[PDB]
């Protein structure tokens, strides 16, 4: 007429009530508050560089509940902290290579970043540097200078730079390093920064082990490049962004090259396009999206989307249910509100990760409301 209690218990809680319904309600609220007190985390530093380091220390070579990997890594993906354009498609690379996406100042490797590199890769004097310890620089010299590349080389690491003359060839360099073994690829326009960040988590979803590559294409050209065509081969393609980001001409070009009809995920703006990525069934299943990330949208300044870039690999590999990234600085769009409402189960969300500073409180409060948190 009681149960036998644990010896370490601080108290014997006897909850009594005159009305079985008032007991029921008390025990129901108790269940709710007990379970509820745990899952809304912020990951941010004073700088965007610190935010990326916070992301690496929390998700790579980490014992954290949602870490992408718990062991030391063999690969880093490094991006110029200012240059969002160059590192734009680097998220799925970071996902498939099991590598943190770090940000560095263009001219000097930040001591904070160097320390995180040694920490996350476990670099030491007593250990041999075989040809497998690698650092990928996603961008040209105007994003990550030669000085920084040499500093990584100086510590004793293989340093490969995934770059080209522009964002397009830079994207293929990155996409080439990534698989394309599931007969599937993503395509984004040169100016579709927020779109690439919207799909970055999805690309970063390992599907039967491999990430899906993202290729940036000249959205106002008559045809995509021969390199894009060769890379894409005979695969299925999903275009992210409207006609102002990737023209109708480019869609046909992809069709003709692959022999397969490409898909299109897009809205009238960046927040709408982000909402659409969430609504798409191939990327997320209705009533099965419990995990969510939030990052700034780039409305105030475009380079502030690096928080999403660094967060996307993690969102793609998050637990056993991939998470999207909701792009919102000061306010959530009505479309994002509806998309999350249809994506989340009737029971609500189980994880919410705010990435970076300057995201207004209304945004987090609203996300908590939609996710019943």
């Amino acid at each position: 007429n009681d149960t036998i209690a644990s010896q370490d218990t601080p108290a014997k809680v006897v909850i009594k009530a005159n009305k079985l319904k008032d007991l029921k309600d008390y025990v129901d609220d108790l269940k709710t508050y007990n379970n509820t007190y745990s899952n809304v985390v912020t990951v941010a530093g004073e700088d965007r560089i610190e935010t990326a380091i916070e992301l690496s220390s929390k998700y790579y070579n980490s014992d954290d509940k949602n870490a992408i990997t718990d062991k030391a890594v063999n690969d880093i993906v490094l991006v110029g902290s200012t240059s969002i354009v160059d590192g734009l498609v680097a998220s799925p690379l970071a996902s498939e290579k099991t590598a943190p996406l770090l940000l560095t100042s263009k001219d000097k490797l930040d001591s904070s970043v160097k320390s995180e590199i040694k920490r996350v890769m476990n670099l030491k004097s007593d250990t041999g540097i075989n040809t497998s310890k690698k650092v990928y620089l996603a961008g040209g010299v105007n994003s990550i200078s030669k000085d920084v590349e040499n500093e990584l080389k100086n510590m004793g690491l293989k340093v490969t730079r995934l770059s080209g003359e522009d964002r397009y060839e830079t994207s293929l360099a990155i996409a080439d390093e990534i698989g394309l073994d599931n007969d599937k690829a993503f395509v984004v326009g040169g100016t579709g920064l927020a779109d690439a960040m919207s799909i970055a988590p999805v690309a970063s979803q390992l599907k039967d082990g491999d990430a899906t590559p993202i290729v940036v294409v000249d959205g106002k050209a008559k045809e995509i490049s021969d390199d894009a065509k060769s890379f894409l081969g005979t695969s299925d393609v999903d275009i992210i962004g409207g006609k102002n980001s990737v023209s109708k001409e480019i869609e046909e070009s992809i069709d003709s090259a692959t022999g397969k009809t490409p898909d299109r995920i897009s809205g009238d703006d960046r927040q709408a396009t982000n909402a659409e990525v969430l609504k798409e069934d191939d990327y997320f299943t209705d009533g099965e999206v419990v995990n969510y990330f939030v990052a700034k949208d780039g409305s105030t300044k475009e380079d502030q989307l690096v928080d999403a870039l660094a967060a996307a690999p993690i969102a793609g590999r998050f637990k056993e249910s991939p998470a999207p990234i909701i792009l919102a600085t000061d306010t959530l769009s009505s479309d994002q509100n509806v998309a999350v409402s249809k994506a989340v189960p009737k029971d609500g969300g189980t994880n919410l990760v705010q990435v970076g500073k300057g995201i207004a409180s209304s945004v987090i409060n609203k996300m908590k409301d939609l996710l019943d948190m």
């Binding site: 601080p10 006897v14 009530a17 005159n18 029921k24 709710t32 508050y33």
Partner: protein
């Protein structure tokens, strides 16, 4: 014995009352053996050498107290005492003449309870032994109460050794069961021929079942019987078996939802972290009890209130 099993969890401050109940249980023969454990290890057995002798039952109770009083009174954080209690509520005798008379008074407080009402033209009830001049049943003088079916008092020949045993003696009733104005002869009231002894038999008398009527036949009755003593266990546990009592070094937090100030379920969550399974199983037994008529060992009516018991993991951070 084992965390999570059915049984009592006594807090340190009530160790004395609980041990007194086990002592009384040994004295009255409800309890045949108590295996005592200090923390996880067995340290002693308490058992009367011969159940028929008083001295042996008292010796068992004194040994019980002597063994556990320092361990319980000086119980440190993380420490506990487990009692595995082999009982048989049916072997209980009432070994104190004061306790026996306390139960006879409990039984005597029922004497005026009506078991069967007087019959009417519409409703079946108590009718007279002999029919009227026309061969029809006429109503009885009085309703059938418990004073009419049995008398109470401690058994003659009783002693502290064999026990005082509160005893029922079946009375006599000439009145029968039927409807008024009916030609069929009244049915004989079968009086208690079994369950005539009750020593507080490791239990409390179930008054919902003791000295209760059992009509047989449905729309056309053919037999009526009255039960003797039918008990309900001092514990929710069955009439024979074993009960686990555990004393712990925890404070008792009485959370009465009907109170003016009590720990709100929110602030309770804020002060302690609770085992999710302890909460959800209790909740399921509440839902089942509410929606269906289902009673459970997890949720119990104790002192006019529905109770659940929680043993939180520990205090919450901040």
């Amino acid at each position: 014995a084992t965390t999570g099993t059915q049984g009592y969890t006594v807090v340190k401050n009530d160790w004395k009352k609980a041990v007194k109940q086990l002592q009384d249980g040994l004295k009255d023969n409800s309890i045949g053996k108590i295996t005592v454990s200090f923390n996880d290890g067995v340290v002693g057995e308490v058992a009367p050498k011969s159940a028929n002798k008083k001295a042996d039952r008292d010796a068992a109770a004194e040994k019980l107290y002597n063994l556990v009083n320092t361990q319980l009174d000086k119980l440190g954080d993380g420490d506990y005492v487990d009692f595995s209690v082999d009982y048989n509520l049916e072997n209980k005798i009432i070994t104190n003449q004061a306790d026996a008379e306390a139960i006879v008074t409990k039984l005597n407080s029922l004497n005026e309870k009506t078991l069967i009402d007087i019959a009417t033209k519409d409703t079946f009830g108590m009718v007279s032994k002999t029919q009227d001049s026309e061969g029809k049943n006429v109503a009885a003088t009085k309703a059938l109460k418990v004073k009419d079916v049995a008398t109470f008092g401690l058994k003659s020949g009783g002693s502290e050794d064999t026990g005082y045993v509160v005893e029922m003696k079946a009375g006599a009733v000439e009145d029968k069961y039927g409807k008024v104005g009916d030609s069929t002869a009244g049915i004989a009231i079968n009086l208690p021929s079994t369950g005539l002894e009750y020593a507080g038999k490791g239990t409390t008398i179930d008054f919902n079942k003791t000295l209760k009527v059992d009509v047989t036949g449905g729309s056309t009755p053919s037999a009526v019987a009255v039960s003797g003593f039918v008990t309900k266990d001092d514990t929710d546990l069955a009439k024979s078996g074993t009960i686990n009592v555990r004393v712990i070094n925890a404070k008792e937090e009485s959370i009465d939802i009907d109170a003016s100030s009590y720990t709100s379920a929110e602030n309770l969550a804020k002060r302690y972290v609770f085992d999710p399974d302890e909460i959800s199983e209790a909740y399921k037994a509440i839902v089942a009890l509410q929606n269906d008529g289902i009673e459970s060992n997890l949720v119990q009516l104790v002192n006019g209130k529905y109770q659940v018991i929680f043993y939180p993991e520990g205090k919450r951070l901040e």
